[PDB]
Symmetry: C5
């Protein structure tokens, strides 16, 4: 029986690399820790947000570090520095865009420590050779993206360990018992449609790029009966897991998008998100550090006011493992 | 079979928040630890007592710390600073009063560390949505209260861990084999009445606000035969647990009130208290640190002299694993 | 089957208190550790010997500490300071003497650390209420003695942990196969008399105060057939454990007394001692730190010369786990 | 059933020694760590490459250390100092060549720490007395080399522990499903030939010296059907393990040779390598630290281009437990 | 079934003491560690060699320490200081000689730390009272020797722990398949003689003093058929263990003697040695630290050349768990 969609991904890899740039120098120089949030745009180009805890800056060196950070047009909020690395500011943007283009590849939250970037990905083993080959083709003289791990999926939660995140992680579960109120992918209420979903990219800009696991009793047209979904109707059939059809899909919902843009405007984000739809009920699962927890009340207040017809509950908030 | 009344509470939450005030500033600045004792008045408004161990003040910074503490009209006794935060000095008094008003909510001992307040609550799951909603509504008014945990009750003793209390906790058991000499809720000796009890607030001022679990063989009128109980006869029916009726009730006894009033006058208090009544016999259970233990002999001497007909034993004092 | 007499004691308590006195001030001020040996005199007044390791005195503060110690008429020997402290023999309040007077109460070795004394006692549960009541009454006379533990007997060896003794403890077993040559309580050789014994006080002066567990096949008169025992013939019947009659008794033997006075004249002592008599054979069990071990050869040499008809063996010396 | 060829080696030894030379002096004086790679030439003379992490040089003494290192004609690349110790610069070259000449002896990666050299070897118990005797004879000519261990094979992975390598080790698995396109030892595709292989020396120069374990259904001539193998056709029969014939053999393949020369030109190397051939498929197993991993993409790119007909996959990269 | 001769020794004791001498003062003063090797002469008087690791001398205090050491005519070799303490300089020589004279007593390696000497012994329980009595009698002459342990044998390897040896211990096994070429105790080859052996003293001078465990199928005259053994034919029958006769015996072999004198001339020694003879094969077992291992090749080279007819093998060298 398929519960967490993580179960359809039989493979996992830990990508590693270095790009030289003043942020990297100080990271290595002063033992700093960055969280690196992958973001895709409408043309599926990969970029990154960088997050730095203000209180993790050694006071001895604050002056030098701040002067380097300020060159990158930072936003400081809730004790967190947020820096955007556009395609140009981020030389490695072209290999990561290639990896992303491999259908079953799901990007997890990354990090930078000791000047080295770590990015976990989860995927389906048929795509393993394509991933390996683009890493090898990409290889030139000098610094190359490489593999610290590739093999069976150790779990989405291993990704947190792989990137050296030491902070306590929490699991948040939200439930929405009347999602049909939003129409779109929730419009069909008579067929017992059931699916699981996880984004290929944790953050995105004017686009959708999801892995849907759909109970094969139904097809995509059973879901898309109106024009109120976000993104586009297009899909790519990936394969089967048990009694589920796996799709890469370019449509989504506005509620998850809203929550994402509100939270990043507060310089916080989740490490992982996936959702479950069955029996006409929507479940949202977030894995986060405490920063996100502080803002949950405000974020849900905003989300409720922007989606006033939606019934939205917190099922539970639990520390993990 | 229901032993500890904790068993009727299937849910638990850890509330967290911050309020700006000089006490908060020094706590964060100098790594201090406060215990925060919730107190309700007759109008069911929540306030707090703050407790600080004198020997936990770093001596280098004592001068600055003491000058801040003295602005809050402190009482110093038995090596402990006691500070009262009235509704006015304590901005967050209105959300917590709202939480308290939710029938099954029981406040545990709170703390403050790193400038952040932690307050555990235990409750019955039917009231979960009401609690969450007032937290979210509160966030719409500016308030920064949030949840570090909400889900199954991990136990009253998890609360001690949640608030980061590192001190050894002890369990004290008192027994009273002739409570009927106090009359009030103990006046009925003919019926095999049985119940468990725990206060919704650890401390209170001229009021009673209890959760009673009453063996459903009997009703509240079976207990209230005279007018010698403390508080008021009023109740709110909450629901059923096994063969027990659960009530919120506004009546109590003078003996427990006396003990509470004596011990706080000595700047000590328990972390948790509940009681059991069955076979005409009363049991009192206290969970405390060593400060309270030092004063148990004096407190019981006082209690005996004020209630000279009552037979009062120490059944057990044990450290908790 | 009853082996260690510890098995007849179903209860245990850890007494705690403070002596207001300069020895207390320096103990707390300079993180010293005292062993506190309870001693009774002929009138059953409890006093204490205080033991301090000379090499545990921080030299930076030796001058101040020595000047305080010398006010108490110390004896220094084998690197150990020995001080006699009498508080109860004169004034009104005499709490430890009162506890001792409770029949089944057995005092273990105490300690003083962080300005607080810890004193374990073992006893039989029928006497629990009497102990608690005198502690509560004692608090009405000013006295600050309280309970850090009261409940089941965790074992004589828990007492060592309770008083925060970190030193390695050793078990010494002596056997005497011809104790009848001393007469007294060993005079009767024709009846299959069997008993266990432990003193209510680890040290004593011109008195005996024992708990005897006697196989109920026999009575006290079966033992006392001559006049050559030490102390008095008097007993108080305490109760039954299995097939053993429990007595408080005021008679003993000269050999155990001799060993005690020799070793304390050398400023060393055991943490616990008990004995077994069966099949006309005597066993002595000592629990001690290494200080006592160093002097065992000399002490046994002395004991043999003072009791030249006695055959005395070391059965075993083992570290305790 | 034989999986890892390590299973044919029932014996293992840890050789230890000291040679006087300035590299040894600084190694001991400043707590440096060298990896030492045994290398053989066409005349089977053993030499060593020395590897030193640049970032492990204490900056305090960098000047002195670098001046000593530069006397040995170092190559610095990828943060690693590589130094070649030729037979004359390396007095102990005569005993180690003798050990190597013992047929079943396999050299593992060695290390130097605290001025002492550690070199693990794995072998078949048949050769134990010969190894011991040459150590004792070698001693007679000047005592230096000795044994820290000799007995059962604890495993190839124990060798990593023996040399005190603290770095995380990784297992890399490559598979080649069409090795027959290289001809040579892979030319025969019609017979169900199966074997395992491991080099007696981790690195080599213009020579081959392998242990082959060949399923005894076939013989060496069944493998060597053309003239396109590297090295020479010669073998020495060592014995049997289960259903496998063990040979020392002087032929190999060009692909593994290429990978070895490319990686050492980058100052990285594996700790261990072995290969498996069965069902027309070749498996290559590498055990390495992270330095090797960084260069895998470049190394495989080079290997693919020099062997364009070969299908080469990464099966797995896993950290070792 | 009897393997290690340690199995015949059911008892063990740890002797402890102090003798005043400048070596003792400095050991205590500077936290030094000595190994103390018991040695007997032809008159069975016990003396000691003292071993001190040069690199364990704190450089701060080297001058003072060396000046004290040099007064005792030290030999320095292989980084080790060796000092002989003759009977006169070693006041305690007379009690230890008495202990040694007790037939079943076996001396292990001793140590001195914190100015206190620790010496483990193993023996057979019938001799316990004799050992205890000479310790007690000794204490009547002034002597400060005492027992930190006496009871069942915890094993020869517990002795290493008792003396606070922190160094890694190794087990070396030698085998000699043709010991009859040395004649003496190995001359009889036609009877299936089997025995185990361990010296009562780890080192000795012109004497033999062994415990032999001889399979009781045979007697001592069955062994001694020629005059080519070392020492004397005399024995003392100790008793039985299973099917083995236990003897104290004053004859031995020249090969073990040679190895001992060569290794101590290099300032190294074993912690324990015993041997097994059965099926015409001799096994020698050594337990040692690494110092001895460094010199094994030289020692065996020397031993082979002095006994050219003897076939010697290293069976195994393993670290001890
Ligand atoms: Ca279905
Ligand atoms: Ca009922
Ligand atoms: Ca009986
Ligand atoms: Ca076959
Ligand atoms: Ca036999
Ligand atoms: Cl999702
Ligand atoms: Cl209560
Ligand atoms: Cl006794
Ligand atoms: Cl290979
Ligand atoms: Cl031997």
């Amino acid at each position: 029986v398929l519960q967490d969609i993580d179960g359809i991904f039989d493979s996992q890899a830990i990508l590693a690399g270095r790009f030289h740039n003043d942020l990297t120098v100080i990271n290595e120089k002063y033992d700093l820790f960055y969280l690196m949030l992958p973001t895709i745009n409408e043309k599926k180009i990969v970029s990154f947000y960088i997050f730095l805890q203000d209180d993790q800056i050694p006071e001895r060196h604050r002056e030098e570090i701040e002067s380097v950070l300020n060159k990158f047009n930072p936003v400081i909020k809730n004790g967190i520095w947020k820096i955007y690395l556009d395609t140009e500011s981020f030389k490695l943007s072209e290999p990561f865009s290639t990896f992303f283009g491999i259908d079953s590849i799901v990007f997890d939250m990354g990090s930078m420590k000791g000047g080295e970037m770590l990015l976990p990905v989860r995927f389906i083993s048929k795509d393993k050779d394509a991933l390996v080959n683009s890493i090898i083709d990409s290889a030139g003289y000098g610094e190359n993206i490489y593999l610290r791990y590739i093999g069976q999926n150790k779990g989405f939660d291993y990704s947190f360990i792989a990137i050296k995140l030491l902070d306590q992680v929490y699991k948040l579960t939200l439930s929405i018992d009347n999602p049909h109120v939003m129409h779109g992918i929730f419009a069909e209420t008579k067929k017992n449609i059931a699916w699981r979903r996880e984004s290929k990219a944790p953050h995105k800009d004017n686009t959708e790029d999801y892995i849907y696991a759909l109970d094969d009793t139904h097809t995509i047209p059973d879901i898309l009966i109106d024009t109120a979904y976000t993104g586009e109707k297009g899909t790519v059939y990936i394969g089967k897991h048990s009694n589920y059809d796996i799709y890469r899909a370019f449509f989504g919902d506005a509620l998850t998008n809203h929550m994402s843009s509100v939270m990043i405007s507060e310089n916080v984000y989740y490490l992982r998100r996936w959702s479950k739809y069955e029996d006409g009920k929507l479940f949202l699962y977030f894995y986060t550090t405490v920063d996100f927890l502080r803002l949950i009340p405000a974020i849900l207040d905003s989300t409720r006011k922007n989606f006033p017809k939606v019934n939205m509950k917190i099922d539970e908030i639990t520390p993990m493992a």
